[PDB]
Design a protein around this nucleic acid. Sequence first.
RNA 1: AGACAGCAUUAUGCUGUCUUU
RNA 2: AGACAGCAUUAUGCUGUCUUU
Lengths: 70, 70
Amino acid sequence: MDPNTVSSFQVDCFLWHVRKRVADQELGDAPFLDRLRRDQKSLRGRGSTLGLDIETATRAGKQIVERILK
Amino acid sequence: MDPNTVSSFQVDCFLWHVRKRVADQELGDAPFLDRLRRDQKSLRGRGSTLGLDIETATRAGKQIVERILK
RNA sequence: AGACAGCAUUAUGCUGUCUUU
RNA sequence: AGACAGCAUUAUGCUGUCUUU
């Protein structure tokens, strides 16, 4: 696998999860929710193409984000 | 200000900053960088429409996300 | 009715990953 | 050449915010 393809997928998965939690807390406006829906479909297609699992990639993206924010 | 319009802007600003830091660490693929550029333009337009500053909104988004992830 | 951003559907151009004799 | 996702430009439909008769 191309390293940056995988890391970008992982980060994108984690950031989608963050956005979902924001939406769950009733903080999203209608466009924010529209983007959440579009991006869920996008990540599903990307995940399938890569043979990777979004839930697993989410944990990896969390690790990456935690590293770069310290 | 519509509450969810402002919170969505703040979260989006913070998540853009996170993606920029990911890019700076050479972890982004070309599409990831393409979206970073598009979303920068989008946030500038949204910020201008709202009369808000992206840098200040980034800090608010950080607080929101930290609260959400606790 | 205007400004801004997005989403959906279409077109055209392009980028990336992977497969491909 | 195929699959997937995106970006750019353009068309149409729509959503939200704000402004405005």
